[PDB]
Design a protein around this ligand. Sequence first.
Ligand SMILES: CCCN1CC(Oc2ccc([C@@H]3c4[nH]c5ccccc5c4C[C@@H](C)N3CC(C)(C)F)cc2)C1
Ligand SMILES: CCCN1CC(Oc2ccc([C@@H]3c4[nH]c5ccccc5c4C[C@@H](C)N3CC(C)(C)F)cc2)C1
Lengths: 213, 230
Amino acid sequence: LSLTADQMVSALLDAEPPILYSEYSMMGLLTNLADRELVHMINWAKRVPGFVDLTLHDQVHLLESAWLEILMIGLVWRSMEHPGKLLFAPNLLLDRNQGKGMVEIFDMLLATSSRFRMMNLQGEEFVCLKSIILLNSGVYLEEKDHIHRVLDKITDTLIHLMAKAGLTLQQQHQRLAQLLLILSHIRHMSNKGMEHLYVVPSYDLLLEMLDAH
Amino acid sequence: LSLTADQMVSALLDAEPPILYSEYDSEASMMGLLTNLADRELVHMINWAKRVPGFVDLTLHDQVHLLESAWLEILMIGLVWRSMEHPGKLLFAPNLLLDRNQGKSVEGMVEIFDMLLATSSRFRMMNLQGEEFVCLKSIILLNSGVYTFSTLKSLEEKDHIHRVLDKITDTLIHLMAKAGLTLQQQHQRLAQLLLILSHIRHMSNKGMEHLYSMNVVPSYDLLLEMLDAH
Ligand SMILES: CCCN1CC(Oc2ccc([C@@H]3c4[nH]c5ccccc5c4C[C@@H](C)N3CC(C)(C)F)cc2)C1
Ligand SMILES: CCCN1CC(Oc2ccc([C@@H]3c4[nH]c5ccccc5c4C[C@@H](C)N3CC(C)(C)F)cc2)C1
């Protein structure tokens, strides 16, 4: 929390999870791949500055509410350079008709990817967005206060990055807004995803992955 | 887009729909009252939407689609705003003030009440201002459905929508600056405010999911007919 903006970025970049491969019907592959990415997400979350300062109870709650959103923005980020296609894994690249109630979700994921592409979303930016999702998704006294301080710190970092890129102050606030409004759509996709399922990772499973002290 | 920030706020403040009342004269009545109230607010919402800058510049079908996507979000943020200075209560109408336990009377309603009450609590501890609220409501209208529209006309709509969003963002920053916030505090509050929209989306989806467990959404032509004036 005392880290500089530059230290925050580098920490988050270093904390980035690996790209996994699909173990190989299509629903089993997407399920299995999601299950394996979950473990690496948990270990990513532990390295997000300020996260392990929360109680384990609250860490689990945040992960319970954020896990699908984080899977999805990750999917969308690496699918950027592959228009009309979703790169779940290097050996699992699917289009919208391979989705044929998954096509609607595929479509939404595809639109979000094109949005990122259009915005020319940078790696240093995406990684901040992912941290914000983790901390923001489940927050609805000392703990909520801490979460909001970390969120504020990431906001600073995002603004710093845009300043470094040479964007004017007006462009900074405008780009910040565009990025955060995208999180609304990711939230929506996660909701529909959870709906199209009804499954979820239990409290105990997440707590186990967290590998307590 | 020629509007200044001051002119943006003014237009949004004038576009504000009226505060409506529940009928004048029971837990078995609750859902009926909440449904009747929602239907009546919908009418004023369409009029409000038309007076949001840039909205009527859009095609009628894109206008319908934005409202199909955002109508429950808009209802809810209005409710949350009305309830801000009434801790533990949801002010659906000045004569319809409900709490948690009254929500219990309907299956799965207490969870939605809790989320709405928590959002009201968030607005409270942020000391959300009226000028900020109408900006946030406008953003919901323009942003919620824009990612679920490739035709050339549609590409032009999206660019227009994103440019109006940019302007509302400029308006939000302006308001926070006049209030005397530092630059750092301005971006920080802008972020905090926009993050709440994620949760409002969340609530709309949970609530939409309730409704299908029991006319539940406005039909295309219903919204069309109200939007498609002569
Ligand atoms: C027991 C632990 C919980 N796991 C069961 C498993 O349930 C899922 C089943 C399918 C999906 C897919 C999926 N898989 C991914 C792998 C890497 C990155 C993105 C994804 C997604 C997003 C999306 C296609 N998911 C389908 C869904 C949930 C209906 F939207 C996500 C979760 C998560
Ligand atoms: C054209 C058909 C669509 N209308 C039928 C009507 O269905 C509803 C029935 C109940 C609700 C309530 C409700 N009512 C309000 C009145 C003014 C402002 C806010 C509200 C809300 C939010 C919330 C409590 N709604 C319940 C629910 C299930 C979450 F949608 C929302 C919609 C909307």
